[PDB]
Each structure stands twice: as C-alpha cells, then as structure tokens.
Design a protein around this nucleic acid. Structure first.
Length: 155
RNA sequence: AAAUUGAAGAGUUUGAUCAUGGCUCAGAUUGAACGCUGGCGGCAGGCCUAACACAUGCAAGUCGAACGGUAACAGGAAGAA
C-alpha cells in the first residue's frame, strides 16, 4: 500500500580489546502518499538487517498532517538540534524543490509542491526530525475556526 | 483581461558521534583569451593594454540672386579671313 524511501546509511564503530566492531545505521521514511509519515532509524551488524529494523520502527511511530491539495497550509519553520528548516507552500507545478533528506520526507508525505530550504546543519537524521517537527505543528483553517470559535471568510 | 509562479545541496577534522568552523565543488554570466575541431545562414559585436609614437589618402564647406571681376573652358558677336 504505502511508499518507503531509504535516505542514509552510515557505518558506525565501537572500539574493543580486539579492535573495531563496525555496525550500520540506516534511516528510512514511510508514508501513505497522503499526509501520514513515520521515520525509523535501525542499527545492525549487516546492512539489510538494519534497513529492516528501520522500516519496522517507521511504520509504528507515524503521524498525521493536514495538507491542502497536495501542498502545505501555510509557511512553516522547524528545528531540531543544528538543523533549521523553512518550508513554504507553492503553486501547482513547482514540484518538490528541496534538499537531500527533506526531499524524501515530503515525497512520501504526499506533498507535491513546496519551496523548502535547510539552514544550519544538514545532518540527515536531524533534518528529518526538523521537517516532521515542522509538518506536525502546522495547522489547518478548520482547526483554527475551532480554537477561536469562528468559521469566517478566513475560511 | 494580463503586467512576475519564488528559495535543493554535496565533499573534506573523528576509532565513531553531535556541534562549531574554514577550504572545495555542482549554476548563471563575459568586449573574453588559449587548446582541439569546424558545413550554411540570420541578427548583433569586435585595442579592456601605451591619453605611446605615427608614413599615406580621405573626415567642412558652400554661396555669382552681396561685390570688383576674368584664369580657365563653353558658346556667341564684331572681325582677321
């Protein structure tokens, strides 16, 4: 049913008496092409073992986001650790113009049209956190009608 | 009626990590030059340096309806023939 990218694969390491124990991190996002998105981050001693642990960790751990016609409601910021991340809704036929890890997250979230920009660090893991941080706090016209107790021509 | 619709990152410090922070790259542009190559046309462009020095030709004349005029070369006239 649902779409599932592999962003990144580091090799990490841990020292012992012997010498080095190498190990692999992978990093994946999944999503329903229609405003749900998890990311998961696996580790294992082999690489295909690790992608699998991530794809599982992503399915559970997966959040809703109200899009509008396949783009954002309004121009959002977002931040995690070093990565700042600004995204802006776009007119139809821009495409997803956007960085490395950003571009994955938005594609499977089912955003079709955005102007992103990553300032700060661009560490893949902290950017997909900062991007999702952005998208989940972003808020629909129907939510704010409810907040303030209206339903105006602002709708 | 229409007169702007616009914003991508990557590599390199560590055994590994996150951060800071430099170096480098991917684009557009040019009165360009150099190298290898080269069929045709259209429209543009062409001493950025020595405001260094210049042979040769040409780049400001016109007016006889302002004037006295004849040296030219066109006729005409008296007149040698």
């Amino acid at each position: 049913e649902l779409q599932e990218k592999l962003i990144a694969v580091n090799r990490v390491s841990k020292t012992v008496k012997g010498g080095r124990i190498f190990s692999f991190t992978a990093l994946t996002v999944v999503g329903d092409g229609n405003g749900r998105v998890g990311f998961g981050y696996g580790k294992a001693r082999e690489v295909p073992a690790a992608i699998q642990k991530a794809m599982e960790k992503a399915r559970r751990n997966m959040i809703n986001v109200a899009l509008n016609n396949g783009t954002l409601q309004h121009p959002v910021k977002g931040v995690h650790t070093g990565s700042r991340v600004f995204m802006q809704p776009a007119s139809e036929g821009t495409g997803i113009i956007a960085g490395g890890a950003m571009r994955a997250v938005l594609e499977v979230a089912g955003v079709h049209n955005v102007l992103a920009k990553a300032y700060g660090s661009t560490n893949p893991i902290n950017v997909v956190r900062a991007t999702i941080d952005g998208l989940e706090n972003m808020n629909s016209p129907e939510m704010v009608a409810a907040k303030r107790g209206k339903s105006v021509e602002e709708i």
